[PDB]
Amino acid sequence: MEVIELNKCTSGQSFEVILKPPSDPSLEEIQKKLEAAEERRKYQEAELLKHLAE
Amino acid sequence: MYTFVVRDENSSVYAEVSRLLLATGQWKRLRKDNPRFNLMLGERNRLPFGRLGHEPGLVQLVNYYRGADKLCRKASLVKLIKTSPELSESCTWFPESYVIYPTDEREVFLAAYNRRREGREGNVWIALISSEASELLDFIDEQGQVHVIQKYLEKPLLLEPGHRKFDIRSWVLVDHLYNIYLYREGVLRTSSEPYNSANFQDKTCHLTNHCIQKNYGRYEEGNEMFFEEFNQYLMDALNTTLENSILLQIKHIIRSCLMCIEPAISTKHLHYQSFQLFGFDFMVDEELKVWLIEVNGAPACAQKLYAELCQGIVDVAISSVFPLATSIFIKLHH
Amino acid sequence: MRECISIHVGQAGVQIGNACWELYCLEHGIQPDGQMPSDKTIGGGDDSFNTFFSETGAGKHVPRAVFVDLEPTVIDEVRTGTYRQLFHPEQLITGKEDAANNYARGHYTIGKEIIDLVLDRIRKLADQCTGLQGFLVFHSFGGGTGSGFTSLLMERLSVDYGKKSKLEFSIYPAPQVSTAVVEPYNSILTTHTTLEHSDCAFMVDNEAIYDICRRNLDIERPTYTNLNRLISQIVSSITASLRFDGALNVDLTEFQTNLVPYPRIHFPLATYAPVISAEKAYHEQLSVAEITNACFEPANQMVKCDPRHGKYMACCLLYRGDVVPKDVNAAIATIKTKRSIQFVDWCPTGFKVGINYQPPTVVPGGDLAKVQRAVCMLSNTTAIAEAWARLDHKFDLMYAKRAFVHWYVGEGMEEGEFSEAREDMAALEKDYEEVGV
Amino acid sequence: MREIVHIQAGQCGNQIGAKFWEVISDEHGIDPTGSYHGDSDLQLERINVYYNEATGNKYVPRAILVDLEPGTMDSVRSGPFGQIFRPDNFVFGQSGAGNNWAKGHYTEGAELVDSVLDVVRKESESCDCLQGFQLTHSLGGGTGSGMGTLLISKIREEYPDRIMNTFSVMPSPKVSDTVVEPYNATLSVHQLVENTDETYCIDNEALYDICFRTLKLTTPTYGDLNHLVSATMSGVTTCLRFPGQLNADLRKLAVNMVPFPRLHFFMPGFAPLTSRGSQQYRALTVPELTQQMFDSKNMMAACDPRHGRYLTVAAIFRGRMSMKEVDEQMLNVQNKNSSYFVEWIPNNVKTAVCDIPPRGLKMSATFIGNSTAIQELFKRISEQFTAMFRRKAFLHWYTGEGMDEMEFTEAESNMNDLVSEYQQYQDA
Ligand SMILES: CCCCCCN(C(=O)[C@@H](NC(=O)[C@H]1CCCCN1C)[C@@H](C)CC)[C@H](C[C@@H](OC(C)=O)c1nc(C(=O)N[C@@H](Cc2ccc(F)cc2)C[C@H](C)C(=O)O)cs1)C(C)C
Ligand SMILES: Nc1nc2c(ncn2[C@@H]2O[C@H](COP(=O)(O)OP(=O)(O)OP(=O)(O)O)[C@@H](O)[C@H]2O)c(=O)[nH]1
Ligand SMILES: Nc1ncnc2c1ncn2[C@@H]1O[C@H](COP(=O)(O)OP(=O)(O)CP(=O)(O)O)[C@@H](O)[C@H]1O
Ligand SMILES: Nc1nc2c(ncn2[C@@H]2O[C@H](COP(=O)(O)OP(=O)(O)O)[C@@H](O)[C@H]2O)c(=O)[nH]1
Ligand SMILES: [Ca+2]
Ligand SMILES: [Mg+2]
Ligand SMILES: [Mg+2]
């Protein structure tokens, strides 16, 4: 129906066509999530080594 | 060896299909959540169409058309007939209907309604049945969900002896290639207690369901007249045939409805395939003019016809896609 | 001119990257040397291609790219392959042992030990940019590095470059070429964590690309090379407006503006046509009407789904080759009467159209045929939520039994991150259904 | 460089281990002296997974030969490939273990274990990025079962974040008449449930039955059994040794195969089943490989796959064939036999193809299944065990080495729990 915004250049052209109208955590918080994961991981390993020492 | 899953256990129609598929010895039923099926006999509501057709090395087929609800819900059908140019407001075979939301086109309804008062012509409408508007709007507001105000047909065709109202049920099967197959056997679901013009209170002579008729079963077995007897009645009493007086109009209505939605629901170039059995409900007036009442997406069959119909669903809808190791349908050509 | 940094994470990201940069070099007439005979400003410039390529005093054109993987094998093939002198060794970052198809291992265990080094090398490219606009991040949903490390990187990029846009090219898992049974887990995890940090994300289902390669390129069993060279065409069609003179999608903010009105629903569907086998002789060239009509076939889409049962909230057509506006608008008129194209009520029914007169470049001796005109449609449709439903179902089947969860808990992830991720996806599926019906 | 350290313990372990090294050295074109004499760079690309590269251009297996008696290792040293192994990696005592798990684990084996760990340490230090360990051993004897499990426990203490992989030979009364083998096997399984990530259950019951029934060898030798073990070991390690997309290392394999940490006992398969010297002149079709590899008669664990469900499966095809046809055939197996693959792990079968076949076969297929039917193997051991243990028979051989009845009860409990755990997921 209606063409608008027609822009042309040597490489090509572009436009819009309408048929019908309408009707972030901080650096700190990231580190505390990574470090807690590492502490849970290191607690698992220490508990394993405790069991093996027994 | 083909495989299938059953996800609606209430389906009288597709219980018989599964039983017949197992009886062939080339189909195996899997448990409902096993995804590695060729055929899904799917659930009524919330069917997971988005999960179909993503299983490598399996051609997958389902017994519903996604988007068929637009034809099979009452409010959707009215909207579909009104807004689709191929059917349009000018559609001669669908009664004048209006979508009415409780507390929309209530304003457009009242304009046409109050024209009929000045016109001095029959002004009865169905939701349920009444001639005054004040009763109908107030009935919807205090009820719950959305309803449809549809023109009630004052002058039905009536069977004799007994002066009785009726509707016709036609079963249609639409396969994966979008062939439209009308089953040759339909059925008249009749009234038993005679049709009264003044008495709208007794909702038995006015509403012709198989269940609501519960005198009963006097004229025929279970208020079900089949097409041989109804054709004979038409030949004797009216000097016409079923084929000529009613069935051409049914064929026309069915094909018009299904062609209109073919672009929206066809599975022709899709990653899964669909078929579906529909039940069209037809009213016939005194001039032998046919009228569409509704379309049912999950119809039941009449007790006599189950064996034949379900074997036909297997032959044309399933074994067409999944072949194994005298045609009951009429192909509606388009 | 405003620079764009590409980041390639994991095997998929890395290997798709190579396909993309090979194709970019061919499109611009840049050689493996890095020399670009046609470029007359030596040692610098503010040309459109300089968005993707910096320049040295010796005349070498060098990608604004970092490749990061937690295992050397695939990045070693970049270091020793055809385009090796194109890249500076600080752009190619490798670990020793990979993430073992484990989000948690990529995100927490190895992510913590490698993240500062990757931001350092990204910062060395940002420093030599006059006006950095943002990042194009390539990765799989299914690999541990692709899922786990990428989601961490994205969180950090929000901190260190808050004002800058971030686009994704994400590879959605498919059993026909998948390497792990926990890819649903990894996909849900990385999607939950990356959702707030991505402005616009282009999902390519490997199932779609695999089938397109069988059906239309007559390839019996597609390899990653077959898949990636097709992916690279779609990616190039999408990035062409950044690398070439034009007035549609010329900066990263325009992708968001034109395709993504709701921030969460930022997953536009890509559809590409035509895809024609090279070894096919006698091929009837497809018209503007025919390739534009092919943009509404599920079989040409990057994700198999049904736009008919859904609603559009934006639609771009990006043409490459012999095309004029007259024939595009004629094609749209036909198409609108024949097909189901509902927009949401609050957007205009309409199409933004970009044409570049140069037809698509093909990799010589490849699988794709040269063609006179091609198109990529970018449509934000709610039908893409089907992809989320499938993935969410596979997740539920495994998670109800806690199958493989111990692998993730073993790397320090809490069992609750699974169900948080899952109910975020439940909310996403609900957002799509609310908009779409 | 993603290195695996190999350890072989006891008669059985050293015998199947020696045969593993003969077979893979031949596939990689390494001769008995360590020299490469192959005709393809695919042989050398991932040679460092199993071989150290010494001066010259010599390749030395990253292999540690362990026993409490000298016989089998003198036999391995004297054998054709014996010169390939590092001489300092032979660690052996003189006493023997007398087919006694307590002697291997606690008394005789305790005396030798630190000198084994020194060799393991030296091999591990030399690795750019060690991925883990593979052990070969029987569960029915003394050294391999008792000392093998002690070694696993010690290695885990030093290297707790590396993968532990075993090839564990299960005892059968068809092969051995030693009365106490169920005791040794139950004690060893208790160890394996706690301290391994992946265990290949190589069942002598199955190996014997295959040799007798299918191969028509009426008097099978250990050599005939081992021929089937060496082929399986080639097959299941292909993805670790050649360039490949699927299960390319031990950890990724574990993440694909082990949905719950205890349920890590695998049922391997192989097609075609051959005997030594009897030539397969006819190459198998992709359809036949696929039927046979899933067939109960091709399983190296005596378990009926139809009595359980597959949690996970890895199928690996070798030789030059159609990838299209492999995919079709693998999809065909799991769609036709759908009820045997748990619906709650989607897409649980993974397929790999390697261009290079084994010696003497053009085509081959190796199966790795985590099936709930493996419970039948443990149930058989458990029944044999309980029959003796309920009367405390032969127990003085173990208490005389310092063990208590409580250990036996605990081991019995843990294995019976394993069995019911498989049953739990079979009915889910
Ligand atoms: C002295 C204790 C040995 C126990 C041997 C068990 N086996 C038997 O046939 C024995 N039968 C039994 O034990 C029966 C009888 C009672 C009822 C049930 N039991 C199991 C006979 C040898 C008894 C007379 C065979 C193994 C046996 O086979 C023979 C001789 O027919 C042996 N095989 C070998 C063997 O394989 N030797 C290898 C070298 C080797 C390999 C493995 C080793 F562990 C040792 C040496 C060289 C040969 C040429 C080869 O490659 O085939 C050595 S002893 C089992 C597979 C059932
Ligand atoms: N299209 C395409 N998909 C790929 C490619 N490589 C891997 N994939 C897919 O990505 C998923 C596997 O993730 P990868 O990217 O290989 O894993 P990764 O990011 O290296 O992570 P880890 O190896 O776990 O550390 C699967 O769905 C693969 O099919 C590729 O080159 N092209
Ligand atoms: N406009 C109209 N004129 C005359 N009769 C009508 C009518 N609308 C409905 N009826 C009568 O009412 C009966 C039932 O109508 P309808 O099928 O719309 O309700 P329904 O959908 O709840 C039954 P079911 O749920 O079993 O499909 C019909 O059999 C018909 O006789
Ligand atoms: N398949 C196979 N089984 C063996 C071999 N040698 C011994 N066995 C079995 O292993 C068990 C005895 O263990 P063995 O390794 O000899 O004792 P160890 O020397 O103390 O470890 C019995 O079940 C034997 O049948 C062999 O070479 N191959
Ligand atoms: Ca320049
Ligand atoms: Mg990787
Ligand atoms: Mg011995």
PDB file of C-alpha atoms in Angstrom, chain B residues 1 28 31 33-34 36 56-58, chain D residues 309 331 334-336 338-339 343 347:
ATOM      1  CA  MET B   1       5.733 -52.334  12.371  1.00  0.00           C
ATOM      2  CA  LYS B  28       1.854 -51.427  18.331  1.00  0.00           C
ATOM      3  CA  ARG B  31       2.909 -45.620  26.424  1.00  0.00           C
ATOM      4  CA  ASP B  33       4.952 -40.172  26.825  1.00  0.00           C
ATOM      5  CA  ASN B  34       7.101 -42.349  24.508  1.00  0.00           C
ATOM      6  CA  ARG B  36       8.963 -42.431  19.104  1.00  0.00           C
ATOM      7  CA  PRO B  56      14.366 -38.400  12.949  1.00  0.00           C
ATOM      8  CA  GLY B  57      13.491 -41.592  11.058  1.00  0.00           C
ATOM      9  CA  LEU B  58       9.773 -41.317  11.888  1.00  0.00           C
TER      10      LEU B  58
ATOM     11  CA  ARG D 309      15.952 -50.919  29.978  1.00  0.00           C
ATOM     12  CA  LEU D 331      17.384 -44.925  14.376  1.00  0.00           C
ATOM     13  CA  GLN D 334      15.608 -47.668  18.814  1.00  0.00           C
ATOM     14  CA  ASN D 335      12.291 -46.993  17.003  1.00  0.00           C
ATOM     15  CA  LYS D 336      11.467 -50.713  16.460  1.00  0.00           C
ATOM     16  CA  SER D 338      11.296 -48.370  21.640  1.00  0.00           C
ATOM     17  CA  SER D 339      10.149 -49.714  25.048  1.00  0.00           C
ATOM     18  CA  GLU D 343      11.593 -42.337  27.867  1.00  0.00           C
ATOM     19  CA  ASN D 347      18.073 -39.279  22.699  1.00  0.00           C
TER      20      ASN D 347
END
